[PDB]
């Protein structure tokens, strides 16, 4: 093939131009994101039964839904959480690669076939189905900084003036709101209701009657009379549009004649429809917009457009409203990807510099800096075709492929220049000769790299997607590289390369280059002599090799595994969890304390504290809270003590000194649709009959038995909430009937007063809002305020609750949770530092085996994945090894020679492991991909050495030792060029401190170690293997 | 309240006896009250912890305490099937015929739940069967409504 | 302009440095293996 | 999948028109074939359990799990789940001047799960140091609790 | 039995907000009548699976 | 595959069965579809040998 | 017209507009390839210009 292009350089230029154009169009037409869809698709059914207890919803809504969650495809598991705030969250997790849309609609329909089984209150409030995997891109804040306008006014202004625009914006998918728009709050007073002998039922009925809509008809409608000339639509009374209108509502007419209104016995307000959650941005009331990115969109352009659209609307805002942008993680994406691109360009430049240092000619260095861009643009095109995006994983795969891209072009050009300098031939015949030497080796190299990088694209779970990204991008790059090297690179080596006479290898040319030539010649002679001496006795080295292998194995077993490194995304989280029976005033005190700490002690590294009171990552109540802390730009946080690790440690140590609270600070992890990903999540289930109490007892027994193995298990904790007090009311019906009281009225009064009641809707400023009816806080605060509530009997005589209440105290759970339709209790844990999660998980299985009857266990989250992806790596790498052996036997036409190439793997693996053990890294994904890269490059080098040796022993009839020596001599230069270029392109990733330091370091450390160790040891050991193998066979 | 009182409440509701003895050594308020008026005795009786009830009544625990509605540890140990705890609270000066803020007695509860051994050991120490709730229903009417016949026989 | 120049200079410096390091490692290891043979 | 989707979209357009006595039982839309792949059976070797008890165990602890296992389209239980069967008697009903309507109102009233709010709800007062969820009534769980009814 | 504006405020403007975040969408129109009947029409790009 | 999943799930709920409850299979079209393919494969092997 | 009153095209017009905006590129692309492919069949940069 290459001889078809050495005579036709313009056809090769044309192919190159086509690839460049395709890659450019792609680059302009590609998404951009931090990470691809890695977490398995999940869907959340969210419901709300206001003024209810976890048992109430768990019995009336959750069990029902879970029962009707039958007949759905590719369901992997199901969880459910029921809180005392009335909310319900059922989370269905499907297999990977499932088209979340069809699953969402499946579950939505199976639910629509269950709505008639729930009570009218849930149907009224509305059951929603959302996609839970996709997390937020940014969060927009809105504060007052002016005459205090409650957060509800801000939420209404947002929902009415800053939500339609943000949703019409490009790239914006789901747009969620933190607060709720206005609602007609009607706070009733039992005393002013007893005055006029009323109840809340009367208020509810009156509102339902005097805020409804009525269909009337038409004025001259069909069938019409003969002669009719007018048809006009009729409009009867409609919904109301203010508080004054709601005031002029007739509840009664006193015997004397006076008419009772609502203005009298009920305060009327425009307020939020839910106060359970509160938000404060630096001690200022705020509202928030959650923004999600749509499939196939660019995060950077989307965020830019959002910021533009929000700058447009500053003119039209009340005095005292400013957007402040908490939780914006697009800058981290920008910086990481820009740094990777910087790395690619620096590698393109270092290739130039190295080729100039080694060859001393500009026309030869022009060649590799023409080929690598072509291959990168072709890779971009392939990504665009296969429906991929530009993200951290893809771009790091490109970085790791730069090494192979450089290797190919350097090999071609260097061999051609060598031939032209030695045999004095011109560029065309020299290139023909080089290609004849090199093309088969290049094809075998491509197929070997394929066998190495492909089988990782068949792992199962969330890690499979990461490996897929890496594998596909690297394989595309390598394939395009071999195609180019066989198509374009020769076409350029045959035209650009200017001829030079024979005998002119570098001797002379006074200066730094005339000196490097002679130094490299001296080093080449020394290395050749050392190899020749090594080949006199080889057994001395087949033992050092086993020593190296054993060291590699020891380092591999002593290398702690991992999933991904934590980074400094510019934000982190703080978590606040008070004791059982707390309120939200106390939680807000604690949150203001945290805010003061952050804005006073860490004033130099912090910009904001978005404190949300009412929502903790595990539970919803006044007892919980979180705080998003957003830090200044990294350019303004110079230092390691000013990073997120150190800030977190300091804040945790400081908040350890807070009383009646468990305040922690943690770093926003890697991919957020996932979680901590310690590979440890556990669920106890009552598979037969048992209730909550025996299940809690079993949970505590397991925690006790787990605290007795602190050498395998640590921080074994439940994620749920512990039981708290409940105010029981044992109503009696005998007395209630003897007094003529409708139990339904009793319950409606109780609920509407203390819990609330969605009554109807109203229309304000062109929007439909609700109408809630509740009590004035003063009369709900304590049990002694219940006797203050009276019901209307049949005989028109009021009755106090104290006549039948018979109240008590009890203990019950505020958060129940189920796993696959069965009651469950979750448990979070970790493997003791020094062991794997498999040992911990097996131990927990053995412990659960010693639990009471009817209690079983099940794994969720990454643990579930870690029960699938644990038995794949060895099989797939065995497949890789066999395929590589076969490709090499084909390339060399011998079943034994390939071994000389399949023993240079530890020579790079041990370097990678040494570098990782020094820098203090883990066996994460980037490290594995770097390992494969080093293996591939060392295999390139060994393959070419062996091919040169064999071609010399066959064609030129040379011997074994002479051929080996001549091969190593001919191959030393390009090996060093490739190794140096790649080490230099990787150095920044190793010495990086800032945005992306984690992944950059995990990549570069291993890659550099492998490069050094292989470059240095292969050139000594591959000859030994070749000689030994050709002798024993 | 005080740090040690809160820690002792936590220990009692969780059921750690060694920590209870320790907190007792440091002079903890054995009468420490929760926000709903409960005490370590209330908790150890609710959750059925026995060793803790002993350890408490040995270090000066108030046995006839009462919460914000009048439920002493007997009202709790009665309708949860706790025999040893009832015996202990009785051998230490518990009002076997107390009342809540709604006129309720341990017999009412032991009858509602259908317990018998509790009712027996309560009658032994002077459990007035003929006490009237705030509605006018004694343990006999409760047993008759529950449909339990052996309880009614024991009560007659 | 500033970035390209700075990176180019960083390279012009660290290229022969790393080349010397690698060639010296090769020299040392070849001497070691000459002694072990 | 698309077929089931369209069928459900058209059926949702009719369910409002059906009787509540039908919506409550539950309308189902399945992709099932017309032939029984398999038939699992459950028996008691001790001879103490009847068909009703075995069927209830199957329906409570074995069916909802098998109706989700990635390939099952429909499940037909060869029995029936438990339920509170209330066998009325017209003679004893007339003796007390009653009717089934009263027996139904009494149950819908006294067997309920009431939403009763919580103490310290939101928005609370300044100085509130307490929060607790109220409990007023719960779904009954035994034949005795159903006999207690008034 | 609802005026046009009534529908436009209670149904049309309520449903026209979510739809802005759909994939491969081209444009959308909507009509709100006096008989209460309301119609929304979303048009997607060519080459889309309906 | 569906029958395998079903049998696995049943094996995952049997340990919690009360005393006496045993599972039986009076209808299964799976064993036929396994043994038939096995017989065809045996035939292929015999044919190779012949 | 007054300010705040904009205009747009839907239906056929939309497509029509698109067409007018798609062609200028369509001519360029469809030319480039011919200049290139020619240069491939006949290795020269001049006769494709001719």
Residue numbers in the entry:
A (entry chain B): 1 to 1033
B (entry chain D): 11 to 166
C (entry chain H): 1 to 37
D (entry chain A): 101 to 250
E (entry chain C): 51 to 100
F (entry chain A): 301 to 350
G (entry chain C): 851 to 900
What does the report in the manuscript say about this coordinate set?
The small protein AcrZ in Escherichia coli interacts with the transmembrane portion of the multidrug efflux pump AcrB and increases resistance of the bacterium to a subset of the antibiotic substrates of that transporter. AcrB is the energy-transducing component of a tripartite multidrug efflux machinery that includes the outer membrane protein TolC and the periplasmic bridging partner AcrA. To investigate how AcrZ affects AcrB, we determined cryo-EM structures of AcrB and the AcrBZ complex reconstituted in a disc in which a bilayer of E. coli lipids is encircled by the membrane scaffold protein saposin A (Frauenfeld et al., 2016). Trimeric AcrB cycles through three states in the transport process, and DARPin associates with the subunits in the loose (L) and tight (T) states, but not with the periplasmic region of the open state (O).
To test the effects of cardiolipin on the conformation of AcrB and AcrBZ, we reconstituted the proteins into saposin discs in which the E. coli lipids were supplemented with an additional 5% cardiolipin (i.e., to ∼10% total abundance). Minor changes were seen when comparing the AcrBZ complexes in the presence and absence of excess cardiolipin. The greatest changes were seen in comparing AcrB with natural lipids with AcrBZ in the lipid environment with added cardiolipin. (A) Channel 2 entry is restricted by a loop region of PC1/2 (light red) for substrate entry from the outer leaflet of the inner membrane in case of AcrB in L state but open in the case of the AcrBZ complex in L (dark red). (B) Once substrate enters the protomer in L, a switch loop (red) allows passage into the deep-binding pocket in AcrB in complex with AcrZ. When AcrBZ saposin discs with supplementary cardiolipin were prepared with the addition of chloramphenicol, additional density was found in the cryo-EM map in the distal pocket of the AcrB protomer in the T state, which could be easily fitted with a molecule of the antibiotic. The chloramphenicol only becomes visible in the T state pocket in the case of AcrBZ with additional cardiolipin. These data suggest that the presence of AcrZ and cardiolipin can influence the occupancy of the substrate in the binding pocket. Molecular dynamics simulations also indicate that chloramphenicol is bound more stably to the binding site of the T protomer of the AcrBZ +10% cardiolipin structure compared with the AcrB structure. Our cryo-EM maps suggest that cardiolipin and AcrZ together also seem to encourage a more discrete binding mode for chloramphenicol in the AcrB distal pocket.
